[PDB]
Amino acid sequence: TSQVRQNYHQDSEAAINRQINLELYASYVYLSMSYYFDRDDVALKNFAKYFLHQSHEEREHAEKLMKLQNQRGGRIFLQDIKKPDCDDWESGLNAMECALHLEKNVNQSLLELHKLATDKNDPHLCDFIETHYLNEQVKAIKELGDHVTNLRKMGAPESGLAEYLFDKHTLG
Amino acid sequence: TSQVRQNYHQDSEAAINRQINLELYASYVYLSMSYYFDRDDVALKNFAKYFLHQSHEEREHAEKLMKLQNQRGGRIFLQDIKKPDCDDWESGLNAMECALHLEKNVNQSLLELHKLATDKNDPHLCDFIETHYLNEQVKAIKELGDHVTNLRKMGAPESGLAEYLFDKHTLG
Amino acid sequence: TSQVRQNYHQDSEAAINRQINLELYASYVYLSMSYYFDRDDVALKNFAKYFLHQSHEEREHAEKLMKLQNQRGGRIFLQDIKKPDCDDWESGLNAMECALHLEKNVNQSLLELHKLATDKNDPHLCDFIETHYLNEQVKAIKELGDHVTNLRKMGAPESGLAEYLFDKHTLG
Amino acid sequence: TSQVRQNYHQDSEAAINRQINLELYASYVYLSMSYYFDRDDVALKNFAKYFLHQSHEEREHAEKLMKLQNQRGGRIFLQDIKKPDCDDWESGLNAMECALHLEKNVNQSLLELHKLATDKNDPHLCDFIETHYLNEQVKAIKELGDHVTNLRKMGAPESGLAEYLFDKHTLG
Amino acid sequence: TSQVRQNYHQDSEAAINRQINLELYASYVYLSMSYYFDRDDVALKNFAKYFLHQSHEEREHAEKLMKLQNQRGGRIFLQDIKKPDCDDWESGLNAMECALHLEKNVNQSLLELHKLATDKNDPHLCDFIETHYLNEQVKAIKELGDHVTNLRKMGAPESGLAEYLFDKHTLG
Amino acid sequence: TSQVRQNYHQDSEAAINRQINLELYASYVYLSMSYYFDRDDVALKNFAKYFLHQSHEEREHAEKLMKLQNQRGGRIFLQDIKKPDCDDWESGLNAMECALHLEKNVNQSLLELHKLATDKNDPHLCDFIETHYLNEQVKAIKELGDHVTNLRKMGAPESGLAEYLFDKHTLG
Known part of the structure; x- marks a missing residue:
């Protein structure tokens, strides 16, 4: 129906x-x-700053997808934003692991989207996904894996000194 | 339970x-x-820019309330963010009127919050509400009323030239 | 035959x-x-400036395709440049609609080219088309659609004041 | 019919x-x-750059003539742009000779135009042709003749070292 | 086995x-x-500088591929670096021709890699290959072909003056 | 055979x-x-950066030796570059110890080279080895020994906090 x-x-x-x-x-x-x-x-101030920065990046990604939907002549239809699965995250390491799991889930969704676009012979959508989302997802997963590995080696759960020093030296 | x-x-x-x-x-x-x-x-590019700026301000207000909740030792409990009541807003004037209605609803909620804080003898919460939310709400309501009045005088619904010129000269 | x-x-x-x-x-x-x-x-001076800028961009696109043809070792073969379908365009809105139709035709040609490149297993050609032509075409179609919508809402054909004000405020 | x-x-x-x-x-x-x-x-990169610069100058000349046609109240009527007579030009010297022949043809056309304007007692058109086209054509013919003479003296066709050195030292 | x-x-x-x-x-x-x-x-100092620059670029390409392997959670496994096929290269033209042959071989390997990635439905790997290796390879092949053509036209093997002048004017 | x-x-x-x-x-x-x-x-990002810097320095040393071979009129003859003895290095301390062992091996090779040059009465080669390789090798061995000592004192193998803090404070 759209002219574009x-x-x-x-x-x-x-x-x-x-x-x-x-x-x-x-x-x-x-x-x-x-x-x-x-x-x-x-x-843990630097953990909070890190996760707030991630939240703003995700909002930017959603806005970019909405702009893409308007560009091609599709119509945006918004649903309810579900509340997160947890209220307390119990440690920096646990929050990092949950963030890694969430990013891998988002990567799987993006890969399904790219496969669907490929099946419909839509090169512009495929290139948009490749250019703006796939490499950023891979980099985010790699960084979260590095953080989880460092916290595990430091002894993150049992020793709070580990999370304290990780907060200052890595995330600070 | 909180030490603060x-x-x-x-x-x-x-x-x-x-x-x-x-x-x-x-x-x-x-x-x-x-x-x-x-x-x-x-x-209408300038309408879109205006409403996006409003959205970012509302997100900032929510973050400030979360910071206040952490400051006093309360616990944040998040719920589902409901989808908006409308998909298409049908005109700039209608969107402005809906924004005015939403801001008046938010002002009523803030006034109820202030009354509750007064009844509990909590001067810090009362002053926080007065300093950061009440005057901003009053200013927002006044500005939205001005915009609605100008669009109505211009002939906003029937004449698209009105919304076009309002987009360039007021919101541009 | 080419060494490259x-x-x-x-x-x-x-x-x-x-x-x-x-x-x-x-x-x-x-x-x-x-x-x-x-x-x-x-x-309508700003309409003329806009269309001249579009003409220069199209010439740049043709030169880039010729450079691509030389890069891969193919041979350029030029044909006659046909004269345009119309010499009088009768309004800014009509010219904008014709430009939109032409850009959609060019987009269809580029999509056929990309499909042909995909069928021949030529990743470099596919990536060249995606990187330099598809998104620019989508953006051009979106912008022309926006212009057509604004002119139609202002009353472009019957009211010359509409085209005058669009010339100053949007294209100026 | 035009008011101007x-x-x-x-x-x-x-x-x-x-x-x-x-x-x-x-x-x-x-x-x-x-x-x-x-x-x-x-x-031969510098030959290509030289001829591309010439092409842009010719496009500018055509645009100036179109502006002149609009200035005096005449109507532009575009025809098909014929494809060039050759696909391969076989040497720098041969391309230079063909460019010289083309420029002399264009000069003859401009002289016929000036004679026609003189016969119709149109001083503005005569002065426009004299000011913007005749001296530029004479300079272009002189420069192309100089290039052809230098290439012939160096031995341009048989010795590729001649065209190589001309590309670096004269056109570079 | 890798968490990423x-x-x-x-x-x-x-x-x-x-x-x-x-x-x-x-x-x-x-x-x-x-x-x-x-x-x-x-x-021939400029030939040496050119080939040293190429060597550093190839080392950078290998390091980028190793970084890609670490990003996706694969494991790097290094083999022996075979000595080159020749120790004396006998002329600038012969070295340029051998470099062209080597770059075409590398391009064929990259095309096989891209086909394998396509068959496995791995869009990130495909886009990585397209973005960082295919166009650079095409440009390198085009440049080496240009150099070989110029040296052949100048008479590179028999006349050492040709290689001397090419060293100063093209590679200098 | 060489004139130099x-x-x-x-x-x-x-x-x-x-x-x-x-x-x-x-x-x-x-x-x-x-x-x-x-x-x-x-x-461990800083360990990786340190070892990459070492790799580039070794490549520079090899290039300098090749330049020396060309300066004196000798002929370079390249062999296969053998793959390293290990795939995984299992800790920062173990990698540091292996690097120390490798540098001591290289120092022994350079001392044998200097003794051979002395026996042949070649003062230029002796001075070249002394000026560019012996002191750099001694400094590298001293630095690697310092790093190994610090990691051992910190408890590098069993405690990952040791390697984490060494990565930030010494190699960062």
């Missing part, structure tokens, strides 16, 4: 809307993580 | 959590409004 | 030559549009 | 349109020459 | 290791070429 | 070629070490 729509399948539009919702959910999860570490009984 | 908690009633904590959810909902509504005007069949 | 030719099918070379001709034709059409609005009985 | 038309004969308008077409054809020929020397089996 | 591994097939990992070895071999070959021209009985 | 050769014994030329191969092998070993620490399950 060309070679844009409806299934691609629906999948783009789903990815928008997933990105907003990830932003919400990162916000919850960030303000968990601002509590007085946790008090 | 002093003169902070549980009802105030619950009301602060509710206000956090309301602020996030307002941010979501403004994001929906902003990307409605980025569509090719609406194409 | 590798994995470059002849059908791809022929399609590249055809795309070169199409780009030059689009440049010619935009030049005709630009100097239509420089007439004393039309006198 | 004064002392502008129809034959002059037709001849101006013909000159516009000739200028566009010359631009096309120079583009073909320029990308002939970008081939890997020719590989 | 996702959608990364083992055959892709093995092919990445093979490409790493090929890149290191190319760097070694270019180093041999570079120091062949530093000999007192050859004494 | 003077007081340059064949055994010295062969030993110089062997030292070139040894330097290239050391560069390869350091590259392997550097990218071992870039893995997600090791994740």
Whole structure:
């Protein structure tokens, strides 16, 4: 119906809307993580700053997907943003592991989106996904894996000195 | 239970959590409004920029309330962010009127919060609400009323030239 | 025969030559549009400047395709540049609609080229098309759609005040 | 019919349109020459740059003639731009000789145009031709003659060292 | 086994290791070429500088592939770097021809890698190859072809004046 | 045979070629070490940066030896660069110990080279070895010994906090 729509399948539009919702959910999860570490009984300032920065990046990703949906002539349809699975994250290492799991889930969703775009012969959507989302996801997963490895080697759960020093020297 | 908690009633904590959810909902509504005007069949760039700026301000307000909740020793509890009431907003004037209605609703919620804080003899919470939320809400309501009045005088619904010129000269 | 030719099918070379001709034709059409609005009985200076800028961009696109043809070891074969379908364009809105139609035609040609490159297993050609032509085409179509929508809302055909104000405020 | 038309004969308008077409054809020929020397089996970068610069100048000349046609109240009528007479130019010296022949042809056309303008008692058109086209044509012919003479003296056809050194020292 | 591994097939990992070895071999070959021209009985300084620059670029390409292997969770496995096929290269033209042959071989290897990645449905690897290796390879092949053509036209083997002047004017 | 050769014994030329191969092998070993620490399950960025810097320094040493071989009129003869003895280095301390062992081996080779040059009465070669290689080797051995001592005192193998803090404070 749109005057600008060309070679844009409806299934691609629906999948783009789903990815928008997933990105907003990830932003919400990162916000919850960030303000968990601002509590007085946790008090890890650099963890909070890191997760807040991640939350803002996820919001930017969702906005970029919405702009893409408008560019191709599709229609945005927003759903409810579900609350995160946890209220307390119990440690920096546990929050890092949960963030890694969430990023791998988002990467799987993006790979499904790219496969769908390939099946519909939509080169512009494929290139958009490759240029703006796949490499950023790979880099994020690699960085979170590095952080988890360093915290595990330091003795993160049992020794709070480990999380304290990781907060200053790596995330500071 | 918190080592920093002093003169902070549980009802105030619950009301602060509710206000956090309301602020996030307002941010979501403004994001929906902003990307409605980025569509090719609406194409009002300055309306979209205005509503995106409003959305970012609402997110900042929610983050400030979360910081306040952490400062006093309360615990943040997040709920689902409901999707906005509308998908298409049908005009700049209608979106402005809906934004005015939403801001008046938020002002009523903040006034209820202030009354609750007064009843519990919590001067810090009362002053926080007065300093950071009440005057900003009054200014926002006044500005939205001015915009609605100008659009109505210009003939906003029937004449698209009115919305075009308002987009360039007022919001540009 | 070329010492640099590798994995470059002849059908791809022929399609590249055809795309070169199409780009030059689009440049010619935009030049005709630009100097239509420089007439004393039309006198829309910013429309003329916009279409001249589009013409120069199309010439750049054709030159880039010729450079690509030389890079892979193919041979450029030029054809006649057909004169545009119209010499008088009758309004800014009509010229914008014709430009939108032309850009959608060029996008369809580029999509056919990308499909042909995919069928021949030529990743370099596919990436070249994706990187330099597909997103620019999508952006151009979106911008032309926005312009057409704004002109239609203002009342572009019947009211010359609409085209006058669009010339100053949007294209100026 | 034009409100600005004064002392502008129809034959002059037709001849101006013909000159516009000739200028566009010359631009096309120079583009073909320029990308002939970008081939890997020719590989004379400075020859290609020289001919591309000539092509851009010819396009500017055509645009100036179109502006002149609009200034006097005549109507532009575009024809097909014929493809150049050759695909391969076989040497720098041969391309230079062909460019010299083309420029002398364009000079003859401009002299016929000036004679026609003189016969119709149109001083503005005569002065426009004298100021913007005749001296530039004479300078171009002189420069091309100098280049042809130097290439012939160096032994351009048989010795490729001649064309190599001319590319670096004269056109570089 | 890696915590960051996702959608990364083992055959892709093995092919990445093979490409790493090929890149290191190319760097070694270019180093041999570079120091062949530093000999007192050859004494072409700019040829040596050119080939040393190529060697450093190949080392950078190998390091980038190793970084890619670490990013996706694969394991690097290094093999022996074979000595180059020749120790004396006998002329600048012969070295240029051998470099062209080597670059075409590397391009064929990269195309096989891209085909393998496509067959395994690995969009990130495909985009990495397209973004960082395919266009650089095409440009390198085009430049080497240009150099070979110019040297052949000047009379590179029989006339040492040709190689001397090419060393100063093109590679200097 | 070389016109520049003077007081340059064949055994010295062969030993110089062997030292070139040894330097290239050391560069390869350091590259392997550097990218071992870039893995997600090791994740010691500063160790990786240190070993990459060492690898580049070894490549520079090999290039300097090749330049020396060309200066005196000898002929470079390259051999295969053997793959390093290990794939995984298992700790920062173990990699440091292996680097120390490798540097002591290289120092022994250089001392044998200097003794050979002394026996052949070649003062220029002796002074070249003394000026550019012996003191650098002594400094490298001293620095690696310091690093090994500090890691051992910190408790490097059993305690990963030791390697983490050494990575930030010494190598950072």
